[PDB]
Structures are given as structure tokens and as C-alpha cells.
Ligand binder design. Structure first.
Ligand SMILES: Nc1ncnc2c1ncn2[C@@H]1O[C@H](COP(=O)(O)OP(=O)(O)O)[C@@H](O)[C@H]1O
Ligand SMILES: CC(=O)N[C@H]1[C@@H](OP(=O)(O)O)O[C@H](CO)[C@H](O)[C@@H]1O
Ligand SMILES: [Cl-]
Ligand SMILES: [Mg+2]
Ligand code: NA
Length: 446
């Protein structure tokens, strides 16, 4: 709708975290914070690597979040600090993102920048901020987005301007891209739009969030592989985006569309008016399974190597020489269908629901592992263990190449799953049960 992030009264005393934030802020800046902002991380139940392709996804917010204590100031200076020494203090007074190197404060700046630009503001929003995030970083739980989103909300609030949760999501999804990742809007959308007690089907263009009621007899558990993967510091992520972009263009061309304008896999389907099942057949016909090379792509599209490199590919991807068009498209179209089916099942709630939902997750994991090639040994091993121990469904979550897994565990298997999994892979940080949490909020002291 037009609804904005809520502002809630809390008793600092009851929240070890805010108390701590409060006290450290005062010691750090000499004054108590005027307000706080929280933006949660999230677990994607199913629908991996498709948001940027324009397809609907099914995440839910987790409890872990990024919490920021704030104090507006008159100077046009931004002073940032973190409760974790791993993240150095930083200050700026700049009127106008390096993306030469991913320093933590640049994620905060992406968020601030999106907001200031949205309002055509040139000057820096003056403030003192102390950051505390408890989402395991670079683990597929969107710690980067929680930070960007929290920073955007902070900025908005300091500016005293208004934005709906939807616009916040839209703006943050584009601003995070200044860090250099060419991802989608799932993470930012769920961070602002989540509601406690329900997952959301997040659809794009236009952005809409729809409640999805999860199975009553099973519990979702996150288990971190503990292999860290920093999306902004590596090229893996963007290569996949490009492969999809290129696949979309070739598909369009093969179907005689105006491919030059095409950027996403979903557009092709949309333009053709066919079903996802049908898009798989088109894919099968239009894209050869063996990889594509730059020169071949260039000949197919009727463009130049230079056009490709500078006009289509991203800087961090201009020297890619192997494009797995077929596999990426196949993963995408099949995965977008799985999300739709998962939602349908949750709504109809058949008897064998957990089982069916579980199968969809397992199918998702194998497509990610085999077709999108975004899993890793540790993830595969953990997923096996989860299943061994009771998970009806288990798969990697978030971008992959390390990070977390998400398992759907029957209630009765819960206690044993946890102990067994722990014992098996880890010999509440890396392994913990979760449930659908609420979205980003503004906090004022009770
Ligand atoms: N609590 C935190 N404090 C400061 N920066 C953080 C925090 N959590 C995440 N970040 C930033 O986000 C980066 C991780 O982003 P990313 O690789 O996209 O992981 P994720 O899968 O969690 O979104 C970190 O390297 C750090 O720069
Ligand atoms: C800000 C960003 O790019 N996040 C993207 C990234 O998630 P994570 O950084 O693992 O949370 O990968 C997932 C894979 O489904 C989506 O593509 C999403 O849009
Ligand atoms: Cl850093
Ligand atoms: Mg991220
Ligand atoms: Na749409």
C-alpha cells in the first residue's frame, strides 16, 4: 500500500541489545541516541536466483537484524561506528561508493545515498550512528541488505520525510547496487514488507507482498555451512546475472522479439504469453547446452565484442569467456514454477503437504547445485546431514557458494534434529530454529 514503517516504543532495559547500544553510544558520542532503527535479515524458503530475473520468491524475515542507534546532528558530518571492532569507525562530510573494495560502511552509504538522491538532496544528512547487526555475515541471510535497508530508514527518519514500505524497498534494492552487486529486490522487499507469523510471496514490477501461511506441523531451521561468501567481493554472483541476461536476449531474438530492450528472463515469457512449462521448451529449442563464448554471442545478437563488453556486461564480468546460457535459463524457469507450486500447496494444504513442500525444496537445492552451480561441498554435505536427521526438505538459501541452508523439519523430529545435526557437522549461532518475523521499524524509548 502506502503504509510506512511503524514507529514503536520499547523499554531499552528489556532489551539487552538496545541497552547495550544505548550505553555504548553514549560512551562513543557523549550523548544518548535520539532513536533507533531495526531492519531484519531473511531466509528464502524457495525461489533462488530468480528475483533479478523478475520472478516471484518466497522468503520470510528472520529474527536477526541490523540495529542502529541514531542522533541527528547539525554539522553535515556523518560519524559511523560499530559494536563489533571488526568493523572500523568511519567519518565523512562528503557532498556527493568506491566499489574498488567492499568496506562495511559503504553499505550504510548505499542506503543513505538512495534516500538523499530520491529527494534530490545534495548535502550530507548529519548524524551519529552506532551499528549492531546480529545476522551472521556473508552467509546468505541478507546481512548486507539489512544494513542497507536500516541505513535508508535511518536517513529517512533523520530527514523527517515520508516513504511507504514499498518505495523504501524499491529504492534500497537499487541503491545496494552501488556496492557493485547486480542483484534483485528480494532481500530489501522482505526486510521492509515482512509481517510476523507469515512468509510472503514477493512479486516484482510492480512490487507486491502476499501472505503465505506455512505448514503448521513443521519448523524451519537454519544451519550455516560456515563457508563465508562475500557477494560484493567476488564475481560469482554477477556472472550468473549476466548469464541470465544474455540467455534472455538470445531467447528473445530466437522468438523474434525486440531483444535489444530485454534484460530479464521473465520478460521473454511475458512477451510470449506462454506458461513457465512452455518457456522450458522454448529454452530447450533456442539455447544449445554446451557453453556459449563471447564471439558466438556477438554473432548471434549482431553486435560487437566492444558493445557486449561495455554495453552489456558488467565491469566485473567483462572477461568471462564461458556462458552457461542453457543451464541458467533452465534453472530459472523451473525454479520460478516451484515457487508457484509451493504457494499453491500451502494454500490448498493437502494432507501430504509437508512432504510435497519438502520435495519442492529438495528439487530447488539440486537445481541450484547442478544447473545453477551455486552450491558448494560444505553446503551439499550439510544438506545431506539435515535430511538424514529428519528434514523433509533442505536446501541452500540466499546466493549460495557457502552460507546457510534452510530445512523444513517435522515438529516431532525437532529436538533430535538439532542435537544430531550439531553433533554431526559442528564438532544457536550457526544452527537455530526460526519462524516468520516482522519487518523494519523505527524504535523510540518507552
Ligand atoms: N553487523 C554488521 N556490521 C557491519 N557490516 C556488516 C554487518 N553485517 C554485514 N555487514 C556488511 O555486509 C557484508 C556481507 O554482505 P554479503 O556478502 O552480501 O552477505 P549476506 O549473504 O549476509 O547478505 C559484510 O562483509 C559487511 O561489510
Ligand atoms: C542484495 C542482493 O543482491 N541479494 C541477492 C542475493 O542474496 P544474499 O546476498 O545471499 O542474501 O542472492 C539472492 C539469491 O536468490 C538474490 O538474487 C538476492 O537478490
Ligand atoms: Cl570493513
Ligand atoms: Mg547480500
Ligand atoms: Na509482475
Amino acid at each position: 500500500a502506502t503504509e510506512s514503517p511503524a514507529t514503536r516504543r520499547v523499554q531499552v532495559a528489556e532489551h539487552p541489545r538496545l541497552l547495550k547500544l544505548k550505553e555504548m553510544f553514549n560512551s562513543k558520542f557523549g550523548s544518548i541516541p535520539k532513536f533507533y532503527v531495526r531492519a531484519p535479515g531473511r531466509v528464502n524458503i524457495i525461489g533462488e536466483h530468480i528475483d533479478y530475473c523478475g520472478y516471484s520468491v518466497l522468503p520470510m524475515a528472520v529474527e536477526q537484524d541490523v540495529l542502529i542507534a541514531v542522533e541527528p546532528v547539525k554539522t553535515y558530518a556523518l560519524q559511523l561506528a560499530n559494536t563489533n571492532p571488526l568493523y572500523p569507525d568511519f567519518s565523512t562530510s562528503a557532498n556527493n561508493i568506491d566499489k574498488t573494495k567492499p568496506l562495511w560502511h559503504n553499505y550504510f552509504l548505499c542506503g543513505l545515498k538512495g534516500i538523499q538522491e530520491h529527494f534530490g538532496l545534495s548535502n550530507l544528512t548529519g548524524m551519529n550512528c552506532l551499528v549492531d547487526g546480529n545476522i551472521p555475515p556473508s552467509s546468505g541471510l541478507s546481512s548486507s541488505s539489512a544494513l542497507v535497508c536500516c541505513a535508508g530508514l535511518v536517513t529517512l527518519t533523520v530527514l523527517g520525510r515520508n516513504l511507504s514500505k514499498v518505495e523504501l524497498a524499491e529504492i534500497c534494492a537499487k541503491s545496494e547496487r552501488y556496492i557493485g552487486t547486480e542483484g534483485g529486490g528480494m532481500d530489501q522487499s522482505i526486510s521492509f514488507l515482512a509481517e510476523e507469523g507469515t512468509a510472503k510471496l514477493i512479486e516484482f514490477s510492480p512490487l507486491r507482498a502476499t501472505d503465505v501461511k506455512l505448514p503448521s506441523g513443521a519448523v524451519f531451521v537454519i544451519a550455516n555451512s560456515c563457508v563465508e561468501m562475500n557477494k560484493a567481493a567476488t564475481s560469482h554472483f554477477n556472472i550468473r546475472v549476466m548469464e541470465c541476461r544474455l540467455a534472455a536476449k538470445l531467447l528473445a531474438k530466437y522468438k523474434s522479439l525486440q531483444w535489444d530492450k530485454v534484460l530479464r528472463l521473465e520478460e521473454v515469457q511475458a512477451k510470449l504469453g506462454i506458461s513457465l512449462e512452455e518457456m522450458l521448451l522454448v529454452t530447450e529449442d533456442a539455447l544449445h547446452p554446451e557453453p556459449y563464448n563471447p564471439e558466438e554471442i556477438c554473432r548471434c545478437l549482431g553486435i560487437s565484442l566492444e558493445e557486449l563488453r561495455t554495453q552489456i556486461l558488467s565491469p566485473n564480468t567483462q572477461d568471462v569467456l564461458i556462458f552457461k546460457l542453457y543451464q541458467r535459463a533452465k534453472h530459472v524457469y523451473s525454479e520460478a514454477a516451484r515457487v508457484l507450486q509451493f504457494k499453491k500447496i500451502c494454500e490448498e494444504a493437502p494432507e501430504n503437504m509437508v512432504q510435497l513442500l519438502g520435495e519442492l525444496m529438495n528439487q530447488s537445492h539440486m537445481s541450484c547445485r547442478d544447473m545453477y552451480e551455486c552450491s558448494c561441498p560444505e553446503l551439499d554435505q550439510l544438506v545431506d546431514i539435515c535430511r538424514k536427521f529428519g528434514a523433509q526438505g533442505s536446501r541452500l538459501t540466499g546466493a549460495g557458494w557457502g552460507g546457510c541452508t534452510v530445512s523444513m523439519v517435522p515438529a516431532d523430529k525437532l529436538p533430535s534434529f538439532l542435537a544430531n545435526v550439531h553433533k554431526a557437522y559442528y564438532q544457536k549461532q550457526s544452527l537455530f530454529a526460526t519462524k516468520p518475523g516482522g519487518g523494519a521499524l523505527v524504535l523510540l524509548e518507552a
